[PDB]
Design a protein around this ligand. Sequence first.
Ligand SMILES: Nc1ncnc2c1ncn2[C@@H]1O[C@H](COP(=O)(O)OP(=O)(O)O)[C@@H](O)[C@H]1O
Ligand SMILES: O=C(O)C[C@@](O)(C(=O)O)[C@H](O)C(=O)O
Ligand SMILES: Nc1ncnc2[nH]cnc12
Ligand SMILES: [Mg+2]
Ligand SMILES: [Mg+2]
Lengths: 324, 421
Amino acid sequence: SKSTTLFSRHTKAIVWGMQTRAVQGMLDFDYVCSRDEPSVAAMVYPFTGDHKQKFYWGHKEILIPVFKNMADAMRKHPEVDVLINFASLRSAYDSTMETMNYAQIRTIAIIAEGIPEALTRKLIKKADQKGVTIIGPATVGGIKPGCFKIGNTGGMLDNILASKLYRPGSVAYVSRSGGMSNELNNIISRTTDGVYEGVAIGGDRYPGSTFMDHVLRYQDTPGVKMIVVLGEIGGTEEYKICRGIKEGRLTKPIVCWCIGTCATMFSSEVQFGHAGACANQASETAVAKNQALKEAGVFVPRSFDELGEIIQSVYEDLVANGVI
Amino acid sequence: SAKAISEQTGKELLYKFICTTSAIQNRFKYARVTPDTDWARLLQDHPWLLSQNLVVKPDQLIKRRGKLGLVGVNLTLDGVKSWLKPRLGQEATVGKATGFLKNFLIEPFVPHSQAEEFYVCIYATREGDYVLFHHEGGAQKLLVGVDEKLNPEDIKKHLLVHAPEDKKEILASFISGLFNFYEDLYFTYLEINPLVVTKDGVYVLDLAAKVDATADYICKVKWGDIEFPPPFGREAYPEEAYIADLDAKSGASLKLTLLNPKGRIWTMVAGGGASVVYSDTICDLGGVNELANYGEYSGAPSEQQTYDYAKTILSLMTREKHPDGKILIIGGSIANFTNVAATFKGIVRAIRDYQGPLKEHEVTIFVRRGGPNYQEGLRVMGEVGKTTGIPIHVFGTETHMTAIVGMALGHRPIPENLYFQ
Ligand SMILES: Nc1ncnc2c1ncn2[C@@H]1O[C@H](COP(=O)(O)OP(=O)(O)O)[C@@H](O)[C@H]1O
Ligand SMILES: O=C(O)C[C@@](O)(C(=O)O)[C@H](O)C(=O)O
Ligand SMILES: Nc1ncnc2[nH]cnc12
Ligand SMILES: [Mg+2]
Ligand SMILES: [Mg+2]
């Protein structure tokens, strides 16, 4: 367990990469959330020299500095405590290790897919030593309505508005899938008072931060009243939720569905899109994990099809009892 | 992802690269046999096949071969050929998977006692690599942390407590070299069962392994043109290699695995997660035996990349007709940043180019998608259906993501009041 709270409406970030569309998407979100200031203070991109990039704060053109060297960006922007890393898979390891030499950075998002698992374990070790939360690799990131969104998460303004992501509700989620996190934004906005915070941990075998890492944050966050987990075949992370409920650590209602039930019906092993989504023992299948979660008191729909219906039912019970 | 390699591949790398004081015996003494083998040429290249008796077994990622009668032990060359007669080229079922036995390894028989069989395994976890040792091979276990070394003295101290005293030096040297080899070549799983140590040295009788295939950019010099075989019960297809080559060329993700080339249910779904959920839904509704593929495209591929992806699928689904026609499920979540207009324009271009075959094969297309510019994407899908005469039913963010699966399979009515929304 590291920090309970990663982001706020005052969070400032450095973006590593020439990702102007993603930065402008963040700023569009920042503006409709009524943030005082843009969430991106600076960019780092070693393939160009120092310069300024034009962005828009509402209708107003503003300038965000781009630095060739990370050290200059950090020095000029001590207020920054988040780095979003769009480095390619080839250099994501080195740039992330470098970021962790700056004590101001407490959260890093790693976008790239295709980082070797042995390199990610070394990132995890250094991040655990320093108490830095890593989201990713191989992720779109996450979104904290009203406060901060990572990169491309949640798309452009039309989707931010449609799914009510400009102000927080009471429902937190954690997902193995980038695209499905935006489907969760949609479902939760239609069935509850909306997303409080959502994180996509990415599809890799060793996510920089796990399901239980975030579930615990949400349990410890007063504004969160219920928690949704979109799990997946592969590994045994989801049994930690069973354990936390049994221990009395997790007391808020948890909804969870693990995708990958089809694998149980195939006659040979199938590697799915996410690098981590392959069951190496019977306990790693989605069917086994869904069954264990149901027996531990997690709210588990019969299939993905019924996920919205069970979220709504849990939400409405919490309202009825005065929790929301 | 971590991918299995053949026993031959793993032994070749080990014999090439491991560093030990131990004299590893029978280095590179293996011969590969398939139904097309020219046996005269095989024997010209491997004269040691006549020098002592042999062991023969399939090398196709089949576990527990000995229990299946699939290891022929202590045979002459004639005995190997007799043993292969009812097996080589034959269909076999292993577990629940069925495939052809078509790739075998022949190696020298190593006489040894049961006491000379050891077990060694190394495998990766979040917290480091566990190293396992057992003196009854054919179990001590130590976590090696991410930044830790594994020296011979560490192996003696932590793992060899039950090992025969006269074999600790050679075992500790071998296991130390094995671990450095595992790290240097980016293995995630490496099992040698049995490792045999006789008076004459170390013999690697069996090897199973996985490597982290994402490390090719680091390891390619040492790995060479490494092959990752499909699981037993599946074939490799040219279309899969074509898509894999596309996947390697940019940051976009393009994946295709053929499950049943003759299946009438085809998917072309965006995203790792959504593609799994749609597959789950298809199988929940009884379609597992008709599901032709698993795959996904995602990470904002271009119009051209998506056209090249789609045309591969449309080609694959118009090879042979099905009495009841076929179904194409073009689905996805509400995308975060994939350009739905650009990608759907590429698919529409493929549909146009294949409209003849698609009508001949009685394909019905169901679409559900949201994301950047999805309204224009849905429009062009509707339009190509109108201009080709192919039936296409187009849905947006107001339709539940997987509802089109039930529609396509007849379990629920098609709601035209939701078109394009
Ligand atoms: N070259 C060999 N010389 C002697 N015995 C062997 C040899 N290869 C295999 N065996 C014996 O046959 C057993 C089964 O073979 P193995 O390759 O371990 O296959 P599996 O583990 O799939 O059953 C081994 O554990 C060993 O006892
Ligand atoms: O197109 C999709 O639905 C998936 C995705 O590309 C997206 O834009 O949300 C996602 O980021 C991923 O990488 O799978
Ligand atoms: N021994 C062999 N038999 C048949 N084809 C081969 N290709 C390479 N070596 C061969
Ligand atoms: Mg064996
Ligand atoms: Mg993906």
